[PDB]
RNA sequence: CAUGGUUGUCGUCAGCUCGUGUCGUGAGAUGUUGGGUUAAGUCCCGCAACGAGCGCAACCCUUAAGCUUAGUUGCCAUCAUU
């Protein structure tokens, strides 16, 4: 990426100085407006040690999961994971999705048991308040658990779009030690991210680019 | 007041719990709370919970309306008769 793109995508604006994090200071170049301004030549560094990171990763055939349930990313995740083949979390991060896999591995193999019901036409033979009620857990898996449906083992890396809002995801990630990619904003914590990209994360166009840039990388590999 | 079996009672009240995960030094907690909703821990939505079980409900019996089958010991409209 060029600081004339991150310029155009927004990257550069920040939260305002009263909600900031005093570790991120580094990133920070300047404040206007009441709002810290992000240092693109930091983040354009950044952004090449993460997209090697994925590279690399995507070389091995690590899988990555991409979490951005916040509105502006939940779009981006969805078909930047769709380009690169990657498991994608857009909705909700349930409790416990990768440390209580076992659980939700037998809650990601209800969803194909069902499909298989439909198939086999059974649905037309269940009692039609029977039917209805499959169809509503059906939709409630897709929801939450339809991106990560195809995987079956625990993601080599993490994209996360906002690690403040995604606290969840990162607890889980430190805990199973998963190498976590993530778009830091002035207010979020940056020590717990192992790879870290400053950047807004409450711009759709500052998220789009970075996620694809991170898709690349997943591509190339 | 050594017991099995059987029973009353709170109360047919909507509870009571567990596995895995997570949190807590720990006893614990979460789930099961919250916003609505229901007869209902009923259901929905949200939510470090994700699920599951015993309860709830439903399946059963009886009662309130038809159809088809059958018609005696039941019934008698169509007629004779008593
Ligand atoms: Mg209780
Ligand atoms: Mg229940
Ligand atoms: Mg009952």
Redesign the pocket.
């Known amino acids: 990426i060029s600081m004339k793109q991150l310029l155009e995508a927004g990257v550069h604006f920040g939260h305002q100085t009263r909600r900031w994090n005093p570790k991120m200071k580094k990133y920070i170049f300047t404040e206007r407006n009441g709002i810290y301004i992000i240092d693109l030549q930091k983040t354009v560094k950044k952004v090449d040690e993460a997209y090697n990171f994925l590279k690399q990763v995507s070389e091995d055939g690590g899988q990555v999961l991409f979490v951005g349930?916040k509105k502006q990313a939940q779009e981006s995740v969805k078909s930047e994971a769709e380009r690169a083949g990657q498991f994608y979390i857009n909705?909700?991060?349930?409790?416990?999705?990768?440390?209580?896999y076992?659980?939700?591995s037998?809650?990601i193999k209800?969803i194909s048991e069902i499909e298989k019901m439909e198939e086999d036409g059974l649905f037309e033979v269940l009692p039609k308040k029977e039917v209805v009620?499959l169809k509503?857990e059906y939709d409630?898996?897709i929801?939450?658990?339809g991106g990560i449906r195809d995987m079956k083992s625990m993601p080599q890396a993490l994209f996360v779009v906002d690690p403040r809002k995604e606290?969840?995801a990162i607890?889980?990630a430190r805990?199973?030690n998963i190498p976590i990619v993530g778009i830091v904003d002035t207010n979020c914590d940056p020590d717990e991210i192992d790879y870290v990209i400053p950047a807004n994360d409450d711009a759709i166009r500052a998220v789009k680019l970075l996620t694809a840039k991170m898709a690349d990388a997943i591509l190339e590999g």
């Open positions: 349930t909705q909700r991060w349930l409790g416990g999705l990768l440390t209580n076992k659980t939700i037998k809650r209800r009620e509503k409630r898996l929801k939450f658990l606290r969840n607890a889980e805990k199973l």
